[PDB]
């Protein structure tokens, strides 16, 4: 009954990712005064299936100069780690209930970076290498700010357990006492997922396709699936972190409905932002985080350390 539970998690994720690509193409279409897919299936509903089948019957390529083992390893890590990020999510019950779910996701997200570094490096081509080193730059920009932003929020929750964030937000969303952190967190998730305006490791208009320019067919699809699975997961995490849904233990489906709507809307906002802004220069991303978010995050970290003590609002360990 646990293996069935695992399949009830990852198969829907791959279906949600498939239809997220359709929803992105439609939403950007209408914001761009056009329609987007509406021929392949009614309202384009069969488009993701056609794209999936086409890629997996397309010829994969191993570049002559590439490092074979790392070339193939890199897409497997990308999808493997993207799905691993979902096992601790309380929806409202996690598949795996971790004491330190917040830190587990931080560690896995750091490991998922290497699927970019090694794919770009193993490709042994210049555009792939340039994209890979942008990933190094991008991680340096957001990782320090991201962890300290989380720490400030967890000082009101009192735990690293993701399920405790549900209990913390039983009377009120944490976005009220921490909207300055929610703002910087929301930006950090765009940088963390290589999403526009921080889509730099791929950066179509500068690097052709960046770190995965040499990938084709199925191996390319794994990277694309991993990206969109990370988009949804990070918006679920944002919803749990700042827009806590009340949980009724006798009607857990009602949590899952309200919780899903919030995550969809947050994911829709990622598409909305992509349609609205130009791309950052990747040294301007580093300065944004280090010169703006970091000084403010450090100050808010001290503030949220002190605030529970001075207001006598320290949460419990459980």
């Amino acid at each position: 009954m646990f293996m069935i539970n695992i399949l009830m998690l990852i198969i829907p994720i791959l279906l949600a990712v498939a239809f997220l690509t359709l929803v992105e193409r439609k939403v950007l279409g209408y914001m761009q005064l056009r329609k987007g897919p509406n021929v392949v299936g009614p309202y384009g509903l069969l488009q993701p299936i056609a794209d999936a089948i086409k890629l997996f019957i397309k010829e994969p390529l191993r570049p002559a100069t590439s490092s074979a083992s790392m070339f193939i390893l890199a897409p497997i890590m990308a999808l493997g780690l993207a799905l691993t990020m979902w096992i601790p999510l309380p929806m409202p019950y996690p598949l795996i209930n971790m004491n330190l779910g917040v830190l587990f996701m931080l560690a896995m997200s750091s490991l998922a970076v290497y699927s970019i570094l090694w794919s770009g490096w193993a490709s042994n081509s210049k555009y792939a290498l340039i994209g890979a080193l942008r990933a190094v730059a991008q991680t340096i920009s957001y990782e320090v700010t991201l962890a300290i932003i989380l720490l400030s929020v967890l000082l009101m929750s009192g735990s690293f357990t993701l399920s405790t964030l549900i209990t913390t937000q039983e009377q009120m969303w944490l976005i009220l006492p921490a909207w300055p952190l929610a703002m910087m967190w929301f930006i950090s998730t765009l940088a963390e997922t290589n999403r526009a305006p921080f889509d730099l490791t791929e950066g179509e208009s500068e690097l052709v396709s960046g770190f995965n320019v040499e990938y084709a067919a199925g191996p390319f699809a794994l990277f694309f699936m991993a990206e969109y699975a990370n988009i949804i997961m990070m918006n679920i995490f944002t919803a749990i972190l700042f827009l806590g849904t009340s949980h009724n233990p006798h009607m857990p489906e009602l949590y899952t409905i309200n919780f899903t709507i919030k995550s969809l809307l947050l994911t829709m906002s990622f598409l909305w932002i992509r349609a609205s802004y130009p791309r950052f220069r990747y040294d301007q991303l580093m300065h944004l985080l280090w010169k703006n978010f970091l000084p403010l995050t450090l100050a808010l970290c001290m503030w949220h350390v002190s605030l529970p003590i001075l207001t006598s609002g320290i949460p419990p360990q459980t």
């Binding site: 279409g29 209408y30 914001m31 761009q32 005064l33 056009r34 329609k35 932002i273 609205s276 802004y277």
Partner: protein, 176 residues
């Protein structure tokens, strides 16, 4: 006269300064940009439903070539070769001789549609309205050789499209 596109010194009163600090910290001008694309999301898209809906054209449209006839069915082309002389692309090739009844008619009339620039000079030069560019633009082919038209192809195009060609010429010949 001239104007300055970017030469304005911003005011330094605490209200204006505080307004800009709010803009920097609350992202108000980036939020405002989100409003615009949101407004477009709720506008009717401009997409037409091709091939069930077509884009609008005019009677002057320069499309596929065709050789025309008189109402009797006689060919208008008299092998004057004015179209062949004016063709900027040298896309027209003509040979002529007296017909079996003595008429001055072509025995070759080729248009290399992969040389042609669809410029319409040939139909301007023609003194008898023999060669025209019809309204058809949907004749892409699967081979290069299919785009090398000879006289039989062009005469068939004339018979195929004459109903529309005549009506377009009727609507625009008074501008010529």
């Amino acid at each position: 006269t001239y104007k300055y596109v970017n030469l304005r010194e911003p005011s330094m009163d605490m209200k204006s300064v505080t307004d800009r600090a709010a803009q920097t910290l609350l992202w108000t001008e980036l939020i405002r940009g989100l409003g615009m694309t949101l407004s477009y999301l709720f506008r009717e898209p401009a997409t037409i439903n091709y091939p069930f809906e077509k884009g609008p054209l005019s009677p002057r449209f320069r499309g596929e070539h065709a050789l025309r006839r008189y109402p009797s069915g006689e060919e208008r082309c008299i092998a004057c070769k004015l179209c062949e002389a004016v063709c900027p692309a040298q896309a027209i090739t003509i040979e002529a001789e007296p017909r079996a009844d003595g008429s001055r008619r072509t025995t070759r009339y080729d248009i290399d549609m992969t040389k042609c620039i669809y410029c319409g000079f040939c139909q301007e030069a023609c003194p008898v309205d023999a060669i025209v560019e019809g309204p058809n633009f949907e004749f892409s082919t699967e081979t290069h050789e299919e785009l090398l038209y000879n006289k039989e192809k062009l005469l068939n195009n004339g018979d195929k499209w004459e109903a529309e060609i005549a009506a377009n010429i009727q609507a625009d010949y008074l501008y010529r």
